[PDB]
Structure formats: structure tokens, C-alpha cells
């Protein structure tokens, strides 16, 4: 029942694309999936069918059309740390693109220049996986948001 999960007063944002949030209560669905992940504050607007950048293109690629909802709330407590977050990582750059609905678990090295990387670094071979910055002493755009 998708009616009790809308007025529960326990979520920050609740945007639905294509399918209306008041019509999926009595609508049948074949397969229902859920991609639970935590990102930054400025990366919440990038999760939309038709955006681009360095996160929505190399990490989690979204199709052009989307017939679902985007659930995302705020924690900023029961999780996170003071003085910096050193637990989770995220890919920044990637030499190749990714098709929508695809997971990349390869710890490859981004090749910026023409020198072969993957193993040897020093110049034109940077580390793509970057660290977050979930700190409760910052503003709003620097808080962890769990996007499902």
C-alpha cells in the first residue's frame, strides 16, 4: 500500500516523475525495485530524468524518461561524523560512460592524459574515488541525504 508511505511525515522530499503520487495506490506493477544510497546535498537536484554532470553520468546514470518516484530524506544524526566523513566513497571522473541501470564495481584509475595509468600514478593518473564531507556543523548543502 503506497498510501501510508506518503503522509507518514517522515520524509524531506518526495517527487514523482511520470506516475502520479496519487494514482499508484490502486495501480498494478510487475517488478518494483529500490536503489538505496546516500549522497551530498547539492547532488540531490542532479537525480532527475534528463540531467548531466560528474555524478549522474559516471556513477548512477538515469534514463531520459522515468515513470516512478524519488524518495529522499535527511539524517545528519544516528550517522555522519564531526571533523570529516571517512567511511563512504564516490566516483568522480571516468574515462568511459555508463548505460542507464548499470552498476560499476571496478576500481579503475582515471586516465586524464595520454600516459597509461591503472597501477602507476604520479602524473595524469588521479584517484577517482573521492571522500565525502558529512559534517553537522556546516550548512544545508553539506548534509547527507539518503536517496532511495
Amino acid at each position, epitope marked *: 500500500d503506497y498510501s501510508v508511505l506518503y503522509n507518514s511525515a517522515s520524509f524531506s522530499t518526495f517527487k514523482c516523475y511520470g506516475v502520479s503520487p496519487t494514482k499508484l495506490n490502486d495501480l498494478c506493477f510487475t517488478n518494483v525495485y529500490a536503489d538505496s544510497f546516500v549522497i551530498r546535498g547539492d547532488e540531490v537536484r542532479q537525480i532527475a530524468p534528463g540531467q548531466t554532470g560528474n555524478i549522474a553520468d559516471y556513477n548512477y546514470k538515469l534514463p531520459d524518461d522515468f515513470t516512478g518516484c524519488v524518495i529522499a530524506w535527511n539524517s545528519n544524526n544516528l550517522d555522519s561524523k564531526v571533523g570529516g566523513n571517512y567511511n563512504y566513497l564516490y566516483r568522480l571522473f571516468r574515462k568511459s560512460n555508463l548505460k542507464p541501470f548499470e552498476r560499476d564495481i571496478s576500481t579503475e584509475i582515471y586516465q586524464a592524459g595520454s*600516459t597509461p595509468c591503472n597501477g602507476v600514478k604520479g602524473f595524469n593518473c*588521479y584517484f577517482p574515488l573521492q571522500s565525502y564531507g558529512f559534517q553537522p556543523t556546516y550548512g544545508v548543502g553539506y548534509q547527507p541525504y539518503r536517496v532511495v
Partner: antibody
Framework: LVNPGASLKMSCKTS????????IHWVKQTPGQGLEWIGA????????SYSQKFKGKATLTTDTSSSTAYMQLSSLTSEDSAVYYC??????????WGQGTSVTVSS | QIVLTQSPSSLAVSVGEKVTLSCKSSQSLLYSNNQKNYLAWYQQKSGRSPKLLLHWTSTRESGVPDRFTGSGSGTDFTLTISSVKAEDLAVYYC?????????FGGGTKLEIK
């Protein structure tokens, strides 16, 4: 015209091509001598790459909004005066290696 | 910090004559993983921007005549030009592509006899 010990800033913008390159290059060539590589720049995280000969005299800054690479030269000398060429580097060359500006150093 | 040595100092070539110029690198510029030689050949006409003629020594540049052909094995790299013309005369240079720091070991003026 820069006196010895002056600071010189050179900026070049690619024409007909919009970014789409993962490296930018700086070359110093004195007349009658071959081209010498100086530094390489990266569009995202700064490459901050400098040649050992030019290390401590060259600083590399890139601004995406400006769309022009910046090179700062310090402790200029009579030997330092030369034609410096803005360049780049993608797969090979795509109208990325631009022209050069003559430098004259005198009091 | 591999310096590259290029010879000779001068090249005398007649119009429509094949010529061979060779640049030697102190260390092999072949990456072990791809087993491919790395090197760049440059043309330097007077009052002109430095221009890449051949890349990797295996691929010709776009809009470049087949007359300019380069074959390089290990440390030794060779570039061969044919049907040389007055416009073609330029300083020829070899640039290491294998590893930083980049070294320009290019160095050959082209003249017409």
C-alpha cells in the same frame, strides 16, 4: 617588456573548439633553439605539473568560466626572454597547439 | 628525465626525393602493458605554431599526406618523407610520449639542395 625579476601573465583561448581536452601545455622556445616543454594543466583537479628546469618559476591556473589557461612567470632573466606557445593535448592534436608570444626582458 | 638525442644537425633534400630522419631515445618508449611505442613527430615552419605530423609513430594525423610515414622500434625512432616540397621544409622534432616529465628530443632542420 618585463624587467629582470618582474611577474608576467600569459592567457590563450582555443578558437573554434570548446574545451573537450584533458590536458593543456606550455612550451618555451628561444630563437635558434628547439621547443622545451614547461607545464601541463588539467581541466578539473589542477594538474599543477611543472618541468624541473622551470619549477618554482612557473605557476598554472585554469578558470572554466574564463575558458583561457593562465601561466605566471617570476624571476625573469635575459636568458628567460623567449617565444612561449600555448598548447593542449587530447587524443593527438585537434587545433589545440596555439601560436606563441615573444617575450623581451630589459631594465 | 630521459633526454632524447636527434641527428643530423642539417638535412639536404632535393624536390621529389625520399629522406629518412632518425631520433634516438636513451630508454625504450614502449609501454609494457599495450606493447606500443610512444613518440610524436613535429613540423616547425618559420612563424608557425608547432604542429604534430605523426602520433604513436603508427597513426598518421588527419589531413596528412601518405608521403610522411614513420616507423619506430624500441629506442630507435625513424620518420621518412617522400616528394619533399618548399612548403614542407621545417624543423623536425621527436617528443617522448611514454612518461612524465615530457622531453622534446626533436631537432632536424630541413633544407632544399
Amino acid at each position: 617588456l618585463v624587467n629582470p625579476g618582474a611577474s608576467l601573465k600569459m592567457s590563450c583561448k582555443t578558437s573554434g573548439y570548446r574545451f573537450t581536452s584533458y590536458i593543456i601545455h606550455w612550451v618555451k622556445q628561444t630563437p635558434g633553439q628547439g621547443l622545451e616543454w614547461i607545464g601541463a594543466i588539467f581541466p578539473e583537479n589542477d594538474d599543477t605539473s611543472y618541468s624541473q628546469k622551470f619549477k618554482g618559476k612557473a605557476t598554472l591556473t585554469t578558470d572554466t568560466s574564463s575558458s583561457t589557461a593562465y601561466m605566471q612567470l617570476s624571476s625573469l632573466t635575459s636568458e628567460d626572454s623567449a617565444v612561449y606557445y600555448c598548447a593542449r593535448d587530447g587524443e593527438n592534436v585537434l587545433d589545440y597547439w596555439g601560436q606563441g608570444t615573444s617575450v623581451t626582458v630589459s631594465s | 628525465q630521459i633526454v632524447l638525442t636527434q641527428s643530423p644537425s642539417s638535412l639536404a633534400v632535393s624536390v621529389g626525393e625520399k629522406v629518412t630522419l632518425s631520433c634516438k631515445s636513451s630508454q625504450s618508449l614502449l609501454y609494457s602493458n599495450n606493447q606500443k611505442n610512444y613518440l610524436a613527430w613535429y613540423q616547425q615552419k618559420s612563424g608557425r605554431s608547432p604542429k604534430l605530423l605523426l602520433h604513436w609513430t603508427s597513426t598518421r594525423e588527419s589531413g596528412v599526406p601518405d608521403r610522411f610515414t614513420g616507423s619506430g622500434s624500441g629506442t630507435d625512432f625513424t620518420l621518412t618523407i617522400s616528394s619533399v616540397k618548399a612548403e614542407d621544409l621545417a624543423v623536425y622534432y621527436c617528443q617522448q610520449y611514454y612518461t612524465y616529465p615530457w622531453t622534446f628530443g626533436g631537432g632536424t632542420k630541413l633544407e632544399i639542395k
